[PDB]
Amino acid sequence: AQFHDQLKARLLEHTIPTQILRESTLAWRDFKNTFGAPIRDFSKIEGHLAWTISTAAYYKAGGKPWKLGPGVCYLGLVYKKIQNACCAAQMFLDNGDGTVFKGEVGPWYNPEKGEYHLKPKEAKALLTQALESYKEQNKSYPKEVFIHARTRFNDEEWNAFNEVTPKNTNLVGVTITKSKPLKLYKTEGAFPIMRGNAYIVDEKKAFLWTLGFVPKLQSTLSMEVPNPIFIEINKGEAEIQQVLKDILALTKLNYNACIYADGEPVTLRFANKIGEILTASTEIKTPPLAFKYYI
Amino acid sequence: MKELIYIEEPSILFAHGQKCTDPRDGLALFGPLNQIYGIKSGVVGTQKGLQIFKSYLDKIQKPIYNHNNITRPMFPGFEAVFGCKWESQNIVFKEITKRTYDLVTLFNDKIITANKNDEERVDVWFVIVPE
Amino acid sequence: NKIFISHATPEDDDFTRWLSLKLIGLGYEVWCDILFLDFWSTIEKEIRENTCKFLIVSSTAGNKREGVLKELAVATKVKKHLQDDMFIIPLAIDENLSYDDINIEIVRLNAIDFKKSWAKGLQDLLDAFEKQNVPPPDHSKSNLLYQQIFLHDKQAIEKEETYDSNWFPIISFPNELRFHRYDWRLPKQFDVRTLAFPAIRYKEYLCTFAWEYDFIHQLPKTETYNGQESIRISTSDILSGRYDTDFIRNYECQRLIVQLINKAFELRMKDKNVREYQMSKTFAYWIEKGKLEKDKFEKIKLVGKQKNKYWHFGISAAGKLYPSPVLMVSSHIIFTMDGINLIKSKSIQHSSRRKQGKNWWNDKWREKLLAFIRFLSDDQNAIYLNVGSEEKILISNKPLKFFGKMSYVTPS
Amino acid sequence: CKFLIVSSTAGNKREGVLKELAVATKVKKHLQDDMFIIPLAIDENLSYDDINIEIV
RNA sequence: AAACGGCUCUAAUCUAUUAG
DNA sequence: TAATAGATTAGAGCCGTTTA
Ligand SMILES: [Mg+2]
């Protein structure tokens, strides 16, 4: 089970960008089921397979495939069960207009079994690390810090966040929950709801279809009926429409895949991946912090 | 009859400042932002794994087709899209021939010895894991 | 100063589109039929009047079609006219077609190899008619051309669309929620979930919307109990959050109401002639085979057959009150061998569900969910929940409806 | 059975003869015989170049 | 572990209450 | 400590490749 994560972790100390490919992936036809068609039928997606592998290989070799289109540091943070470990992934725009998307590492440990929240010290450490990274990349503190996670934030950890952020900087806490049961269909067409539609419930909570039918691709990013992601602004002050726009933008930077877009903001997904990598093996002091060593 | 708002599709930048929504179509049309000159591919795995990776890297050069080319675009070919060379004849090979720990250790120490001792540079190591 | 590209349109559409878009990117005026949304006279005018190069794509289907052959013929006539040997540049792209079996009219020309690494072929084309003096690069033109014709056929349009959801609103609640002071009439070790009406053990009280004398058949000590001991709480204040007292908080009271809704709907399916199967967190309710006319409700199939197994559409209900009083039914597929007996193994059920949902899409899912909910309904536009002898929970048959100002043209 | 098209300077680009030739090639494709349409070139000024694609 | 999804399964925690 | 819910959360597998 844990070959990929352990292998990627043990190479973190001596930073070596690596890509794991299975023989059943590169040459899927050779491996049948002893009865017929191969285990991994990639015939319909062979071009897509080549696309994705090529994109991954170009990214891990120091290539920047596509950018995004300021002053906002998007901090997607995710907890992993082990004690729980919080691992972040930051993305922001510099004065050079080149999106910086590396991921904040050095996971912060909450010893409580089921508390998917940070203690004040760990929260201060995480926010200081993110703010200092933004300052060193941009020569100034961020105008907004868009902290988002798959969990809600308690008052004490958000109070630590607010105590540790400097002045004239506003931070907004966003919870993106998947598989919330709102299967919203289309009574007219035979195809699912077009991607990008958002059901704004209140000023702080809403549903978003980051995935679904796209006119440009003339089909769906997802089988069946799309599952909307629930965006709740449980902490901070921000417009719900702006938050939805930002989440849709973050759904674009999946450099691990060559797909039009993914159902979740990519900061959360990449933070999850580096969290698996970190928690796979022993502790690493100042881990590499660049995605090509994790994804 | 609750209002469903629309959020405009964000455009991801590409080479020459050309913005397109689809990463695949934008990559094929214009290309990546920065021009790495090539991939010094390094491969750790079995000889059969090396053969499989080399055959697939040969196939990558020629354009390949999806079954439905409009729902999911074609791959023009690695040099056609990215503008950098990734041939299969320029591969640094590392032959191989609690179980999880030692199985990871095999590929791991192969990679570390190759990155440490070997003179030939590798930009990214393609671990061809058997099945 | 145009670069004419001739090809077999359906077979070589992708290659021609890529090459033409690139060439327009580098700053070369390019003419192709797939780049334009009679026509043949325009083709002749462009070929004879102001084209510099004539590229012909040479796949195995680009040499046996009449149209490509005759544009190549007019091209060679113009080639002999200009007295320029550099007019017709073949572009062989197919591995199956060798440098033999190729048309006489194009057999003698020096082709450019696109068989491998289209980038090398494009580089050969570029350094070919760069020193061949064929007449600034502006990739924005290529992006625009990609958007106008390759993209405009399908895009986001200002079209109104209407949507059915998973959310079925709760039309009406029982007005008063009743806590019963059941010290000794209710055994402490008795399970309140098997009571004939939904019941929670809250603060030693018996949370229910039901009257104090419903729990008689299986709880006979509860008779002769004073109704003043019961605390009756306005459900409207619970929903609006007005009721927040030291006795009971608003959120926990709403949690009790949601537990009541879920349990009552569970017993409703218990009496609704619908079978149940155990999921991880909830129960899935599906119709057995043969319990519907031609395996259909109205005109929507809810039970069918695939590869010696049978599938039953199933629903799993759970209420919530945050946006409004409304439950969210969930759509599942439950598999069986003979349609009446369940498959015990869960992995085979999962594989069968992933097989069956492969061909199901928005229309099928929505029609099956709506058919199921209208099937369980007693009232024409509502479903009854027996939470009290005189009190009931009304669930709207029509789920919450939505509408959007932007949509797409449905391809079919 | 056969379709002889006059191929003079005026008779190879006029609209009516062009449409008749177009439907002629359509029925030729339907009949699957290459021995259908016959151009009769009569005009000294009109060379074998500059002639219509559909008959070239 | 090319990948993204749809599901299926399991566990934990926080609340409120009841029995230890 | 055990239980009964509802709400949040997290982990695993597992199948299909997005109706032309
Ligand atoms: Mg990957």
Q: Is A273 annotated as a binding residue?
A: no
Residue C278 Cβ < 7 Å to strand E: yes
Asked if strand E contacts A222 at the CB level, meaning under 7 A, the answer is: yes
Sign of CA dihedral A109, A110, A116, A120: negative
List chains touching C (3+ CB pairs under 8 A).
Answer: A, B, D
Local structure of C293: helix, strand or coil: strand
A39 touches strand E (CB under 7 A): no
The answer to whether the Cα torsion of C95, C98, C99, C101 is positive or negative is: negative
Kindly state whether C163 is in contact with chain B, defined as any CB-CB distance less than 8 angstroms: yes
The closest CB to that of C18, out of B6, B15, B28, belongs to B28
**Closest residue in chain C to residue A180, using alpha carbons only:** C328
**Helix (H) or strand (E) run with residue C35 in it:** none
**Burial of B82 (C-beta count, 10 Å sphere; 0-12/13-18/19+):** buried
Residue A57, nucleotide of least CA–C1' distance: E2
Q: Are C235 and C245 within 8 A, CB to CB?
A: no
What is each CA distance from C357 to A39, C56, C335, in whole angstroms? 19, 45, 12
Sequence-distant (≥ 6) Cβ neighbours of residue A151 within 8 angstroms? A79, A116, A117, A175
| Distance between CA atoms of residues C357 and D23, nearest Å | 48
Report CA(C172)–C1'(F13) in Å, whole number.
42
Residues 195-254 of C with CB under 7 A from strand F: 254
Which chain F nucleotides are covered by protein, judged by CB under 7 A?
A: 4-20
Resolution (A): 2.9
d(CA C37, CA C147): 12
Q: How far is the CA of A115 from the C1' of E11 (A)?
A: 14
What's chain A look like in SS3? CCHHHHHHHHCCCCCCCEEEEEHHHHCCCCCCCCCCCCCCCCCCCHHHHHHHHHHHHHHHCCCCCCCCCCCEEEEEEEEEECCEEEEEEEEECCCCCCCEECCCCCCEEECCCCCCCCCHHHHHHHHHHHHHHHHHHHCCCCCEEEEEECCCCCHHHHHHHHHHCCCCCEEEEEEEECCCCCCCCCCCCCCCCECCEEEECCCCEEEECCCCEECCCCEECCCCCCCCEEEEEEECCCCHHHHHHHHHHHCCCCCCCCCCCCCCCHHHHHHHHHHHHHHHCCCCCCCCCCHHHCC
DSSP D38: E
Instruction: Judge whether C140 is closer than 8 Å to chain B, CB to CB.
Output: yes
A119 is in an annotated binding site: no
Alpha-carbon separation of residue D29 from C11, C66, C218, D32 (angstroms): 20, 10, 86, 5
Instruction: Residue C363: list chain A partners with CB under 8 A.
Output: 185-186, 189-191
User: Which nucleotide shows the minimum CA-to-C1' distance to residue A227?
Assistant: E6
List the C347 CA – F13 C1' distance (angstroms): 10
Classify D17 in phi/psi space as left (phi over 0), alpha (psi -120 to 50) or beta: alpha
Reference A241, options A265, A208, A195, A214; nearest CA is: A208
B27/A65 Cβ within 8 A? yes
Burial label, A111 (beta-carbon count in 10 A; 0-12, 13-18, 19+): exposed
Q: At which residue do the structure tokens 């540049």 appear?
A: C89
Tokens for C254, please give them: 């709403």
Experimental technique, in short, is cryo-EM
- Flag if B27 and A67 touch (Cβ within 8 Å): no
Contact A236, A170 (CB under 8 A): yes
Mutating which of A5, A13, A21, A202 best tests the B interface, going by the most B Cβ atoms within 10 A?
A21
DSSP 8-state secondary structure symbol assigned to residue C57: E
- Of C320, C328, C327, C329, which is closest to residue C239 (Cα–Cα)? C320
Q: How many angstroms separate the CA of C186 from the C1' of E20?
A: 19
Which of C362, C411, C409, C402 is closest to C157 using CA atoms? C409
Ligand-binding annotation for A295, yes or no, is yes
Q: Which of A283, A291, A268, A281 is nearest to A15 (CA)?
A: A291
Backbone angles phi, psi at C30, to 5 degrees: -125, 135
Chain A residues within 8 A of C167 when measuring between CB atoms: 182
Torsion sign, CA atoms C195, C197, C200, C206: negative
The 8 Å CB, 24+ separation contacts for C109-114 are C111/C58, C114/C15
Shortest Cα distance, chain D CAs vs residue C70, angstroms? 6
Distance CA C221, CA C216 (A): 8
**Residues of chain C with C-beta less than 8 angstroms from the C-beta of D49:** 77-78, 80-81
